[PDB]
């Protein structure tokens, strides 16, 4: 509607936190763990681990598009500027009553069922010179991946190679042309952030990301396993779920982007590894063009 120049900040946003709590509450009401293990500490070093056992009914789990709107007294601003890095002023600004469809997909190292960037692949980082800051990548072309029961996932090799190539090109645009882009697997950590994890059909899938994230400038089948013992993304702790239901478990998702981390440093080479584990970034992917102001 109105047209003014307004400063947008994606890295600090209330919508990200509120959506985070909403999805946490959603997973709290929908998916019930058979056994929940949470840390409890008084600050005296020793920490007693509390265990909560409840019913764990198997339910059908699918993400649904969720539009977000501002109630009376508030309005949501939207940046229509092409290739917006996520921060700073914005020329064309449209005030929207409701945000577009956003699927609450919880996953690491890969963004599924999201939204593609229109004119090209766009990378966004709070601080690019900071190696601790996660880099959000948004593709201009979707890559379909078929994941089936008993863990495996087949996807197009050529499309993924070309994708990694273009992403590498954009990384050469950001970090300079003299640098050589080399992709490597995770440096290690909790099994959730080391491999590619996600929820399909109410079951937790962990697929090996090594084949995808190993690449250099000069029909991929990912082995997958269903883990019934996982680390809760909502809060620090572990949870044990029910055995995987019998029959075919299959989900075909579109990959709209990735989460990457950059190694620290010299000399002439930059290493990029799969990131994620923070779902706030996953919401920030679709929420980067939105902000909340009061009228």
């Amino acid at each position, epitope marked *: 509607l109105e047209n003014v120049t307004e400063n947008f900040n994606m890295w600090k946003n209330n919508m990200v936190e509120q959506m985070h709590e909403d999805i946490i509450s959603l997973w709290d009401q929908s998916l019930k763990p*058979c*056994v929940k293990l949470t840390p409890l500490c008084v600050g005296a070093g020793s920490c007693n681990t509390s*265990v909560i*056992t409840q019913a764990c009914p198997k339910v059908s789990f699918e993400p649904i598009p969720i539009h977000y709107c501002a109630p009376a007294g508030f309005a949501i601003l939207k940046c229509n500027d092409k290739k917006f890095n996520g921060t700073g002023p914005c020329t064309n600004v449209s005030t929207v009553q409701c945000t577009h469809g956003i699927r609450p997909v919880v996953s690491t190292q890969l963004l599924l069922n999201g939204s593609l960037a229109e004119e090209e692949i766009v990378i966004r980082s709070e601080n690019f010179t900071n190696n601790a800051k996660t880099i959000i990548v948004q593709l201009n072309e979707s890559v379909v991946i078929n994941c089936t029961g008993a863990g495996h996932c087949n996807l197009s090799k050529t499309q993924w190679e070309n994708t990694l190539e273009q992403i590498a090109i954009k990384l050469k645009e950001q970090f300079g042309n003299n640098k050589t882009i080399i992709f490597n697997p995770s440096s290690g950590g909790d099994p959730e952030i080391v491999t590619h994890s996600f929820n399909c059909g109410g079951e937790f899938f962990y697929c090996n990301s090594t084949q995808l994230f190993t690449w250099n400038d000069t029909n991929i089948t990912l082995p997958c*396993r269903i*883990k019934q*013992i996982i680390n809760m993304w909502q809060e620090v702790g572990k949870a*044990m779920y029910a*055995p995987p239901i019998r029959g075919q478990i299959r989900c075909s998702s579109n990959i709209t982007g990735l989460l990457l981390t950059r190694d620290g440093g010299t000399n002439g080479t930059e290493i990029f590894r799969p990131g994620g584990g923070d779902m706030r970034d996953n919401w920030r992917s679709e929420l980067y063009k939105y902000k909340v102001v009061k009228i």
Partner: antibody
Amino acid sequence: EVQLVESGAEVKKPGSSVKVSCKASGDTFIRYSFTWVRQAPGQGLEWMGRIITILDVAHYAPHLQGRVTITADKSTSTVYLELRNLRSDDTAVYFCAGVYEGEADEGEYDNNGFLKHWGQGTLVTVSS
Amino acid sequence: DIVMTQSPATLSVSPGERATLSCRASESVSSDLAWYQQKPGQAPRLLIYGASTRATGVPARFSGSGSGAEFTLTISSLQSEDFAVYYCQQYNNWPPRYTFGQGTRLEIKR
């Protein structure tokens, strides 16, 4: 192969407490879930409770709740059963049992409630 | 509070014949059922689990069947060591509360 060897027979006075042990060997200790089943003489089987080894979590029967505690020592690979406030009706043969849940360290748990393996049994007599 | 009741209490079958045991539940236990065999002075032995599957070490003559609140343990040919006290178990519900049948005594008929 599976090997389960329980503690010797115990004799306690009413009001006291009894603690029996069950030694497990031949396989990985954290990959199994351990259930205790007591059988009164002339009577049938009764489920006391079942403990998950990997998560160190134990569940008990509603009627035995709060007066019984099932624990697991992973270092010595031994499952302990503790019963307090013993009564004359608590006299029975206590069987230590367990079942293979798959690989618990890799996150695979079948959560099986049945019992594949059993122990030799431990006679516990509570009388004055 | 699932109650497992087995029928009959005592079944006398002549050697070389077929034996049929029944196990009923107060409510549907679904696909979760366990048949055990026990001999005097000995610990119970696992026979059937899930009621559709025969355990390792168990002769093929033992066959489980049924669903819901109804179950049947069928033995094609009774051998000398086949006579014992049989039990049924419900592991279905969560948080776990498990119950056993009152037992079915198999007797040699002469």
